[PDB]
């Protein structure tokens, strides 16, 4: 191998050129494969987004306040349509003096019905200590471990950061005002 | 008034917390063997998965796969227009009416 | 199947009450499908995501200048010597 390489690249600059070209070719082919897999992953992510958009059409991401307000809005629109139609029908039937006219205004406006009940995301319970998630205890050999970091310089045991949803401040109340002092870097807010 | 929001919380790195990234990490890049494995399976005529077949034998009712540009990405879709049934009589219930107030057997 | 107006999780979505929409999407769906992951999303790349591996980054190199030093240094004992007094090891290991 060394013979075949030095035969074709006897000098250091040529050896370096060949090495760099090898690296570039490797990187390019790796980029091709990664681009293909990235296209697949992009498609899967887009289908996840489509699922989440579907949930929003059904009001799954809405809150109960928003659901009630939409319900009231439909109710009010329907009520107003009905009473306006009643006023028109009564006026026309009064000027005509005929009950069949009122009867005929019963079918001037029926796709389906409004939903009887609704379910949302905020009704699903969450909590490490919340007993709304606990049916039976999960055995210890199936529960996951918290990360461990311990050295002279830093640790992760003087505080608790929480879960992905229910987060909390790692530092305690007396040193929260001096959080800037427990950092190698600090990027403050914009205001 | 939700898009293009301002920075509300601070961003920081605690002292001596590790980073796990070397100096060539920007030149590092990922890789999966799945494309090469697919090419090799196709070329060597190895056992295919059943996701290449649109028909679905995994249930009694007929299902057909809908593919998103690739045999690796599919969802089964049922074909039957299912008939539903109700062993219920019509017109026997008026839930809007309060029945505890009306006098009768239905009310009791 | 017993308390329909009180169990909304097992109920159809509001798109089902609307009576209006090769293969079509199904007309009836429950909210209980929210308790499943791969109900609506596909199972593509399900078992191939734990196979995308990345190597570590640690380099085990440190120059060892002994010309700077002229004294010995202490050293830990890591394991007990079993090549000597092997037969008695369970009997004297607890002493000091």
């Amino acid at each position: 191998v060394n013979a075949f390489v030095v035969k074709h690249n006897p000098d250091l600059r040529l050896q370096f050129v060949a090495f760099a070209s090898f690296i570039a070719t490797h990187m390019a082919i790796t980029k091709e494969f990664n681009d293909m897999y990235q296209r697949l992953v992009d498609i899967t992510s887009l289908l996840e987004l489509q699922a989440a958009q579907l949930h929003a059409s059904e009001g799954f991401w809405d809150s109960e306040s928003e659901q009630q307000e939409a319900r009231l809005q439909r109710h009010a629109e329907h009520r107003n349509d009905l009473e306006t139609t009643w006023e028109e029908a009564l006026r026309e039937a009064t000027l005509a003096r005929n009950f069949d006219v009122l009867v005929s205004y019963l079918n001037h406006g029926q796709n389906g019905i409004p939903p009887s009940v609704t379910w949302n995301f905020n009704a699903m319970p969450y909590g490490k200590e919340n007993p709304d998630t606990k049916t039976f205890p999960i055995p210890d050999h199936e529960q996951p471990y918290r990360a461990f970091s311990l050295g002279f310089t830093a640790n992760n045991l003087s505080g608790n950061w929480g879960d992905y949803i229910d987060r909390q401040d790692n530092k305690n109340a007396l040193m929260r005002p001096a959080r800037m002092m427990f950092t190698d870097v600090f990027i403050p807010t914009t205001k | 008034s939700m898009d293009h929001g301002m920075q509300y919380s601070s961003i920081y790195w605690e002292t001596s917390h590790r980073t796990y990234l070397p100096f060539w990490a920007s030149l590092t890049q990922k890789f999966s063997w799945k494309i090469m494995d697919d090419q090799i399976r196709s070329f060597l005529r190895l056992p295919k998965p059943v996701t290449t077949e649109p028909f679905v034998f995994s249930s009694g009712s007929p299902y057909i796969r809908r593919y998103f540009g690739d045999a690796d990405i599919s969802v089964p879709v049922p074909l039957h227009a299912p008939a539903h049934f109700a062993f219920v009589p019509t017109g026997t219930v008026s839930p809007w009416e309060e029945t505890g107030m009306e006098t009768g057997p239905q009310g009791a | 199947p017993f308390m329909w107006r009180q169990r909304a999780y097992c109920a159809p979505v509001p798109s089902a009450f609307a009576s209006q929409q090769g293969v079509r999407k199904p007309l009836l769906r429950s909210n209980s499908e929210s308790l499943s992951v791969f109900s609506q999303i596909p199972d593509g790349l399900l078992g191939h995501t734990t196979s995308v591996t990345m190597g570590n980054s640690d380099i085990f190199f440190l120059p060892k200048p002994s010309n700077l030093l002229k004294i010995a240094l202490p050293a830990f004992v890591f394991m007990p010597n079993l090549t000597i007094f092997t037969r008695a090891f369970p009997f004297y290991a607890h002493t000091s």
């Binding site: 990235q38 | 990922k30 | 995501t49 570590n56």
Partner: peptide
């Protein structure tokens, strides 16, 4: 020898999975 052993130990013996988006 140290670079070779680190390379082998890292890219053959200490591979771990990573997420893809």
């Amino acid at each position: 020898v140290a670079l070779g052993a680190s390379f082998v130990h890292d890219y053959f013996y200490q591979r771990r999975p990573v997420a893809w988006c």
